[PDB]
Amino acid sequence: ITSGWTFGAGPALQIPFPMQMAYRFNGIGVTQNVLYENQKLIANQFNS
Amino acid sequence: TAPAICHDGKAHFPREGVFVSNGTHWFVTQRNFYEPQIITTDNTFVSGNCDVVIGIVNNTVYDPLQPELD
Ligand SMILES: *[C@@H]1O[C@H](CO)[C@@H](O[C@@H]2O[C@H](CO)[C@@H](O)[C@H](O)[C@H]2NC(C)=O)[C@H](O)[C@H]1NC(C)=O
Ligand SMILES: *[C@@H]1O[C@H](CO)[C@@H](O[C@@H]2O[C@H](CO)[C@@H](O)[C@H](O)[C@H]2NC(C)=O)[C@H](O)[C@H]1NC(C)=O
Ligand SMILES: *[C@@H]1O[C@H](CO)[C@@H](O[C@@H]2O[C@H](CO)[C@@H](O)[C@H](O)[C@H]2NC(C)=O)[C@H](O)[C@H]1NC(C)=O
Ligand SMILES: *[C@@H]1O[C@H](CO)[C@@H](O[C@@H]2O[C@H](CO)[C@@H](O)[C@H](O)[C@H]2NC(C)=O)[C@H](O)[C@H]1NC(C)=O
């Protein structure tokens, strides 16, 4: 949650979480603007 | 860091990399090695307006065209 996937290849590197989720969308073929303009929806859907 | 940069009322997002600030100026870097470059219109792409991104910051994105045309 605080370091993403960096602690498994060396030192834990902090990065804010909203930006971690944007990277993760990029890794599946979705552009990052789709998350940032819908951040509230994805957080509501995850929490439910 | 910041997710996007505002210029001319438009939101700019990095093609690859993250925005960083050294204390006084902002740069684009690749994510795996620190190597800053100036934020230009060839480094970024435009999508949406600066009203939907949380944490967007003001900066200058430089266009190479105008200083070539003096
Ligand atoms: C994408 O789908 C979601 C539902 O999966 C839509 O969100 C719902 O919209 C309805 C109608 O406004 C609301 O009553 C629900 O409360 C919303 N659900 C959640 C979890 O927020 C969303 O509007 C759709 N997006 C578009 C662009 O149509
Ligand atoms: C952040 O980096 C910049 C660029 O290196 C520093 O700003 C100065 O920028 C001018 C050009 O606009 C250069 O001619 C200077 O040599 C730069 N100074 C230095 C010390 O590099 C700026 O100082 C840096 N900020 C911090 C807080 O270190
Ligand atoms: C990150 O969190 C800090 C608090 O830990 C936020 O700082 C506050 O910002 C508000 C305005 O948004 C101020 O009214 C408060 O006084 C600030 N708190 C402190 C302790 O200085 C900061 O805004 C957050 N950053 C983002 C991008 O949301
Ligand atoms: C980033 O720059 C924009 C553009 O100058 C700022 O938008 C202005 O915001 C002020 C209030 O802070 C309004 O009075 C102006 O009308 C806005 N200008 C326009 C053209 O809409 C924005 O506030 C700046 N952001 C920060 C954090 O300073």
DSSP assignment string, B11-44: EEEESSSEEEE-SS-EEEE-SSS---B--BTTTE
Please report the resolution in angstroms.
Answer: 3.3
User: Is residue B27 within 8 Å of B5, Cβ to Cβ?
Assistant: no
Residue B53 contacts A where some CB pair is shorter than 8 Å: yes
Breaks in chain B, after residue numbers (C to N greater than 2.5 Å)? none
Provide the token pair at B39: 């934020």
Return d(Cα B39, Cα B41) in angstroms, integer: 7
If you search the block for the tokens 């045309």, which residue do you land on?
B69
By CA distance, what is A26's nearest residue in B?
B16
Chain B residues close to A36, C-beta within 8 Å: 3-4, 13, 52-54
DSSP assignment string, chain A: --STTSTTSSS-----HHHHHHHHHHTTT--THHHHTSHHHHHHHHH-
Residue A19 contacts B where some CB pair is shorter than 8 Å: yes
Residue B47 contacts A where some CB pair is shorter than 8 Å: yes
* H-run or E-run covering B65: helix B65-68
Picking from B1, B52, B55, the nearest residue to A37 by CB comes out as: B52
Return d(Cα A23, Cα A31) in angstroms, integer: 9
User: Is residue B11 within 8 Å of B4, Cβ to Cβ?
Assistant: yes
User: Is residue B40 within 8 Å of A4, Cβ to Cβ?
Assistant: no
Residue of B67, B54, B64 lying closest to B11 (CA atoms): B54
Cα-based torsion angle of the residue sequence A25, A26, A30, A32 in order, rounded to the nearest 10 degrees:
80
Query: Pocket around ligand 2: residues whose beta carbon is below 6 Å from it?
Result: B 22-25
Return d(Cα A36, Cα A18) in angstroms, integer: 8
Return d(Cα A19, Cα A15) in angstroms, integer: 7
Residue of A5, A2, A1 lying closest to A27 (CA atoms): A5
Return d(Cα B9, Cα B56) in angstroms, integer: 11
Q: What technique was this entry resolved by?
A: cryo-EM
Provide the token pair at B54: 């949380």
Strands B57-58 and B5-7, sheet pairing: parallel
